[PDB]
């Protein structure tokens, strides 16, 4: 565990993280994909051997000794708001299980279903709150990665609102 487990946010490519493992915003078929998933494919391609896993689940594959946790959030273009919300919560619960099992002291995590799986809606708060629900009972240092300047401010404010 971390000595004083924390939440932080950084605005940069998750492929350049300084944590002991990474969560991929994966597709269910283990394809290279786009966005976070393509950056992860370019950085850790070995981790996509048998990474295919259903929506709402997480599957870890080692790149050397570095764990890549493939977490499959729902595509809100296909799911109802209700079913998508349930699967998005489930995917983060499976990330907390894997982080715990691996015994890491830190993890880099993107906000699942907020990019091309968002169904064209702003899901910062919905996705972040499911991340907190899952990760709050873990003792890893969590570092959230984003790319947008206003998202960085809103994520930083939500973290600070606790503490
Ligand atoms: Cl960068
Ligand atoms: Cl996405
Ligand atoms: Cl972002």
């Amino acid at each position: 565990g971390a000595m004083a487990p924390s939440y932080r946010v950084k605005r940069m490519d998750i492929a350049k993280n300084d944590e002991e493992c990474v969560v991929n915003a994966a597709n269910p078929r283990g394809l290279p994909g786009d966005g976070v998933c393509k950056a992860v494919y370019k950085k850790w391609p070995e981790s996509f051997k048998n990474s295919a896993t259903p929506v709402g689940t997480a599957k870890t594959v080692m790149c050397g000794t570095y764990p890549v946790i493939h977490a499959v959030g729902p595509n809100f273009s296909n799911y109802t708001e209700s079913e998508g919300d349930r699967e998005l919560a489930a995917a983060y619960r499976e990330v907390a299980k894997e982080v715990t099992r691996l015994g890491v002291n830190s993890v880099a995590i993107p906000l699942l279903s907020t990019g091309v799986y968002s169904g064209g809606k702003d899901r910062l708060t919905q996705s972040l709150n499911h991340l907190f629900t899952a990760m709050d009972s873990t003792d890893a240092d969590v570092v959230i990665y984003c790319r947008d300047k206003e998202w960085e401010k809103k994520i930083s404010e939500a973290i600070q609102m606790r503490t």
Side-chain angles (χ1 to χ4, degrees):
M3 261 299 106
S6 65
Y7 287 110
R8 298 173 52 233
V9 56
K10 291 204 293 178
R11 183 185 83 100
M12 52 182 282
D13 189 352
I14 198 169
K16 303 178 195 201
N17 77 76
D18 194 29
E19 288 68 61
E20 287 181 1
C21 70
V22 69
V23 175
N24 183 29
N27 62 69
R29 303 177 180 274
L31 296 157
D34 320 75
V36 162
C37 190
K38 175 50 61 56
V40 167
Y41 183 73
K42 286 190 175 142
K43 183 57 65 175
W44 303 285
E46 297 91 343
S47 78
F48 288 71
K49 194 160 184 285
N50 294 307
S51 63
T53 198
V55 172
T57 77
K59 182 160 203 200
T60 304
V61 184
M62 306 302 292
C63 174
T65 70
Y66 187 80
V68 175
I69 304 171
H70 299 273
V72 184
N75 176 5
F76 275 95
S77 293
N78 297 332
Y79 283 88
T80 63
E81 287 290 335
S82 177
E83 199 76 354
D85 184 71
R86 186 184 61 67
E87 290 297 3
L88 176 57
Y92 281 118
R93 296 186 296 274
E94 299 300 309
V95 165
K97 292 174 193 181
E98 283 297 281
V99 165
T100 300
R101 184 185 63 74
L102 288 164
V104 293
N105 295 331
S106 68
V107 54
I109 190 153
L111 298 185
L112 299 178
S113 297
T114 62
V116 300
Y117 280 9
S118 68
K121 287 188 192 161
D122 165 359
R123 300 189 183 275
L124 191 170
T125 298
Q126 170 181 29
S127 185
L128 183 56
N129 279 341
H130 286 321
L131 186 162
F132 286 150
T133 297
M135 298 304 294
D136 275 350
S137 68
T138 71
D139 66 359
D141 283 336
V142 172
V143 182
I144 302 165
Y145 286 76
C146 68
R147 294 310 289 268
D148 180 275
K149 291 170 158 180
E150 297 309 311
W151 281 45
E152 181 188 13
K153 293 179 198 159
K154 283 176 274 181
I155 302 160
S156 183
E157 290 156 353
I159 292 167
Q160 290 319 132
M161 277 321 273
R162 335 172 98 203
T163 80

